[PDB]
Design a protein around this ligand. Structure first.
Ligand SMILES: CCOC(=O)NCCCNC(=O)OCCO[C@H]1[C@H](O[C@H]2[C@H](O)[C@@H](O)[C@H](O)O[C@@H]2CO)O[C@H](CO)[C@H](O[C@H]2O[C@H](CO)[C@H](O)[C@H](O)[C@H]2O)[C@@H]1O
Ligand SMILES: *O[C@H]1[C@H](O[C@H]2[C@H](O)[C@@H](O)[C@H](O)O[C@@H]2CO)O[C@H](CO)[C@H](O[C@H]2O[C@H](CO)[C@H](O)[C@H](O)[C@H]2O)[C@@H]1O
Ligand SMILES: *O[C@H]1[C@H](O[C@H]2[C@H](O)[C@@H](O)[C@H](O)O[C@@H]2CO)O[C@H](CO)[C@H](O[C@H]2O[C@H](CO)[C@H](O)[C@H](O)[C@H]2O)[C@@H]1O
Ligand SMILES: OC[C@H]1O[C@H](O[C@@H]2[C@H](O)[C@@H](O)[C@H](O[C@H]3[C@H](O)[C@@H](O)[C@H](O)O[C@@H]3CO)O[C@@H]2CO)[C@H](O)[C@@H](O)[C@H]1O
Ligand SMILES: OC[C@H]1O[C@H](O[C@@H]2[C@H](O)[C@@H](O)[C@H](O[C@H]3[C@H](O)[C@@H](O)[C@H](O)O[C@@H]3CO)O[C@@H]2CO)[C@H](O)[C@@H](O)[C@H]1O
Ligand SMILES: OC[C@H]1O[C@H](O[C@@H]2[C@H](O)[C@@H](O)[C@H](O[C@H]3[C@H](O)[C@@H](O)[C@H](O)O[C@@H]3CO)O[C@@H]2CO)[C@H](O)[C@@H](O)[C@H]1O
Ligand SMILES: OC[C@H]1O[C@H](O)[C@H](O)[C@@H](O)[C@H]1O
Lengths: 69, 69, 69, 69, 69
């Protein structure tokens, strides 16, 4: 899957359908994987740099692949 | 959903029906989403500023949407 | 439910039946709610002040309601 | 159950059958309770002193009772 | 099982099939154990030294055994 954005996690949002939105770079993206919820929040809290991989590389787009650096 | 309150998390409470109550701004609110329990506690512990979105914007009211900043 | 004890968590104990015991104030109490295990450990580790609410307010008594301050 | 060892968690090990091994005092012990995995890793990380209770107080022996101090 | 690599966790990656990849030493490896996801991310965040034990000791190989030092 292609790289989409890389950056620190500007903010996260828990959504009304139990998905989890994230803002990284200039993109707001979401993931239906519940596993990623607390990893992403930890990244946000500790100031990790993450890379998100997705073909739906647009605001509102979905993702499931993330790299924690 | 409309913004309801924004602030740091004043306190949380685990309830007898496994719901989780949170005090943010001047509102005490609850969420039946189990997934939010540890996110909300981490936010509380680290001093994050959260925004809760809900149409039931009164003490005792329910929520599922939260933004972690 | 009435207040039972208020204090920092002196120590916790994982029990052989997968319940979790906590010492707060002068009381040892337990909870069969798995969700509370890591919340109570976190409170212990970070020195949070908790309040436990239970009508079984004696050593060995059960609880499910906790306030995290 | 009798006390078996007391000390800081020298190391943990995740095992091929999803059990979790821990080195405390002079004993290596394991637990088949999944709930304890992240508690024991948090105790290791923050330098908590634990006591493990078990009748199988020998290397390789099993446990489910832990006290977090 | 034989030792494979030892080191700090250079990066992790959540994969599209809910497995978790990890870079330690000169090897990129994955595990299908969901339990290990947040343990390995904690090790990464806190700068723990891990050892991975696997007979598939090449890039892209699988593991389930980790030692946290
Ligand atoms: C005032 C003293 O009494 C109480 O405070 N009682 C609290 C308990 C009863 N709670 C309750 O009924 O919650 C459900 C109704 O509340 C949810 C609210 O529903 C809206 C509905 O969607 C609207 O279209 C309609 O006009 O009215 C009601 C209320 O204004 O919606 C909000 C979000 O917009 C909450 O739902 C969210 O939280 C709960 C709990 O976490 C639940 O998951 C929902 O799935 C989630 O959306 C209110 O609870
Ligand atoms: O031999 C067991 C196996 O033991 C594991 C152990 O859990 C770890 O400490 C170690 O590192 O790896 C050893 C070697 O395998 O555990 C599995 C299940 O988790 C099997 O255990 C069951 O088998 C027995 C037959 O009844 C007995 O009841 C065990 O106590 C069961 O749990 C395997 O046989
Ligand atoms: O392919 C497996 C690997 O299989 C071994 C098998 O263990 C040997 O007895 C055989 O002779 O050699 C094959 C090939 O290496 O087992 C390794 C660890 O020894 C990996 O297996 C683990 O990883 C998997 C995905 O993480 C899954 O968790 C397995 O259950 C683990 O055993 C490798 O993938
Ligand atoms: O028996 C349960 C409960 O019933 C009554 O309260 C009702 C709702 O439960 C309560 O949420 C609601 O609160 C109102 C405030 O009073 C109102 O001023 C504010 O604008 O919003 C909320 C919700 O719309 O009130 C109703 C009844 O009007 C009972 O009154 C209460 O004691 C409690 O027993
Ligand atoms: O976590 C793994 C395992 O831990 C606990 O069991 C311990 C040993 O695994 C087990 O073999 C041991 O059996 C005891 C009996 O209780 C006792 O009656 C008998 O006489 O002696 C044996 C061997 O010494 O018990 C210990 C701790 O008491 C846990 O209870 C168990 O379910 C399992 O998780
Ligand atoms: O410490 C908490 C808990 O962990 C251990 O059980 C594990 C999971 O927590 C549990 O939900 C899971 O149960 C399996 C059943 O064994 C199986 O019959 C069914 O088909 O699938 C479920 C859902 O996965 O199993 C694991 C352990 O294999 C621990 O043994 C348990 O008693 C308790 O302490
Ligand atoms: O919290 C999760 C769930 O765990 C188990 C208990 O028996 C329940 O009553 C409930 O707590």
């Amino acid at each position: 899957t292609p790289d989409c954005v890389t950056g620190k996690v500007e903010y996260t949002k828990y959504n009304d359908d139990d998905t989890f939105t994230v803002k990284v770079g200039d993109k707001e993206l979401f993931t239906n994987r519940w596993n990623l919820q607390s990893l992403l929040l930890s990244a946000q809290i500790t100031g990790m740099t993450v890379t998100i991989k997705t073909n739906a590389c647009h605001n509102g787009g979905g993702f499931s692949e993330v790299i924690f650096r």
